[PDB]
Design a protein around this ligand. Structure first.
Ligand SMILES: c1ccc(-c2nnc(N3CCN(c4ncccn4)CC3)cc2-c2ccncc2)cc1
Ligand SMILES: c1ccc(-c2nnc(N3CCN(c4ncccn4)CC3)cc2-c2ccncc2)cc1
Ligand SMILES: Fc1ccc(-c2n[nH]cc2-c2ccncc2)cc1
Ligand SMILES: [Cl-]
Ligand SMILES: [Zn+2]
Length: 347
């Protein structure tokens, strides 16, 4: 067992191994609290996240296990992975807190887009990285489901990592988001059978914003969001309308004054046409015809970066736990096993 030390930061107390020094708070939320620290063992600057109320409910307990399982599995340059995980608990009985450690990423895509107007080269590189990470995530039968600028970490070298790839249709009001500018329309329609391309829709929205400096669809509610979307891409054709089982949703859409698809060249005026072509393949209303991450990587917009030999897929990921209905103490025990069995990556 390593030697731990205690300290209080803001209103959050922290108990971590001595290897981590100079903890300074970076921010907190529904997820947990995060501190930047210096890892004396590796010489790296790391981010240390203390989970918030990990075993409050079966929802938190299962989510704590899920995040740990996800982070332990993700080994890819464009996806956050685990440098370390620890608890000050000496045994299961006193197991109450989980701390996760990863490489420190000093900014997110919001800081980047707001503080400066990115060049086309930057847009290509950043979007390239997101897609390369999504290709990997998606290959493990994982859907991010909430991609947005504040979920994309970026460092001073313009290297990018996807974070938060750990929620589902939950019965809690913590972390509730009012309207989501980056969400696929099928999600705004509460479709229960969406596919991995919901993430591609988000990339499209993010990419648009990096090119124009404006949120593409700043809707105030789910319906306002959907109307802004249909204004750009036009109202659904016969083929897509036929895929809507929800009688009320289908009928509402059909009762809207019908709208044509806008010419993307007029909307994203001044943008690299290759960029506009890709945007158009990403922002397809029918998810069945939306481009995949793997296909997008091979789009001519990324010719400067695309390398099939260096766009890997993930090892098989066991999500069978997702269907389990267990007691809080069972999820806690499983999580504890995962902490104790963690093998750090080679330096
Ligand atoms: C790997 C990484 C870090 C460590 C480490 N472990 N314990 C450390 N001590 C623990 C005890 N030490 C102490 N002990 C008694 C009185 C006053 N101070 C304070 C700092 C420092 C350190 C430490 C080492 C290197 N740089 C900074 C801190 C051990 C292995
Ligand atoms: C291990 C250690 C830290 C993390 C980590 N977790 N969450 C992070 N974000 C910070 C804020 N982000 C956010 N903020 C506002 C709205 C929606 N999301 C959500 C969570 C950043 C980070 C983070 C921060 C800095 N560097 C790397 C990762 C994950 C695993
Ligand atoms: F107005 C819209 C917006 C999006 C969709 C949509 N795109 N892909 C799948 C769907 C969809 C929506 C609702 N139910 C089934 C499928 C359908 C209608
Ligand atoms: Cl995909
Ligand atoms: Zn909760």
């Amino acid at each position: 067992r390593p030697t731990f030390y205690r300290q209080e930061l803001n209103k959050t107390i922290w108990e971590v191994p001595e290897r981590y020094q100079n903890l300074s708070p970076v921010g907190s939320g529904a997820y947990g609290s995060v501190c930047a620290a210096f890892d004396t063992k590796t010489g790296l600057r790391v981010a240390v996240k203390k989970l918030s109320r990990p075993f409050q409910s079966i929802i938190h307990a299962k989510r704590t296990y899920r995040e740990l399982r996800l982070l332990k599995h993700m080994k890819h340059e464009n996806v956050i992975g685990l440098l370390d995980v620890f608890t000050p608990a000496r045994s299961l009985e006193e197991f109450n807190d989980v701390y996760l450690v990863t490489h420190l990423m000093g900014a997110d895509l919001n800081n980047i887009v707001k503080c400066q107007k990115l060049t086309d080269d930057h847009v290509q590189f950043l979007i390239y990285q997101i897609l390369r990470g999504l290709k990997y995530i998606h290959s493990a039968d994982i859907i991010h489901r909430d991609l947005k600028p504040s979920n994309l970490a970026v460092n001073e070298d313009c290297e990018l990592k996807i974070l938060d790839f750990a929620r589902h249709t939950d019965d809690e009001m913590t972390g509730y988001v009012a309207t989501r500018w980056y969400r696929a329309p099928e999600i705004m329609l509460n479709w229960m059978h969406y596919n991995q391309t919901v993430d591609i829709w988000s990339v499209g929205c993010i990419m648009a914003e990096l090119l124009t400096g404006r949120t593409l669809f700043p809707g105030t509610d789910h319906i306002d969001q959907l109307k802004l979307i249909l204004r750009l891409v036009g109202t659904p054709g016969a083929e897509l309308l036929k895929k809507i089982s929800s009688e009320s949703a289908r009928n509402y859409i059909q009762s809207l004054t019908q709208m044509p698809k806008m010419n993307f060249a007029n909307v994203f005026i001044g943008a690299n046409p290759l960029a506009v072509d890709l945007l158009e393949k990403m922002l397809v209303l029918d998810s069945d015809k939306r481009i995949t991450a793997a296909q997008a990587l091979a789009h001519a917009y990324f010719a400067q970066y695309h390398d099939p030999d260096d766009e890997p897929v993930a090892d098989p990921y066991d999500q069978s736990f997702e269907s389990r209905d267990l007691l809080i103490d069972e999820w806690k025990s499983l999580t504890y096993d995962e902490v104790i069995s963690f093998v750090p990556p080679p330096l």
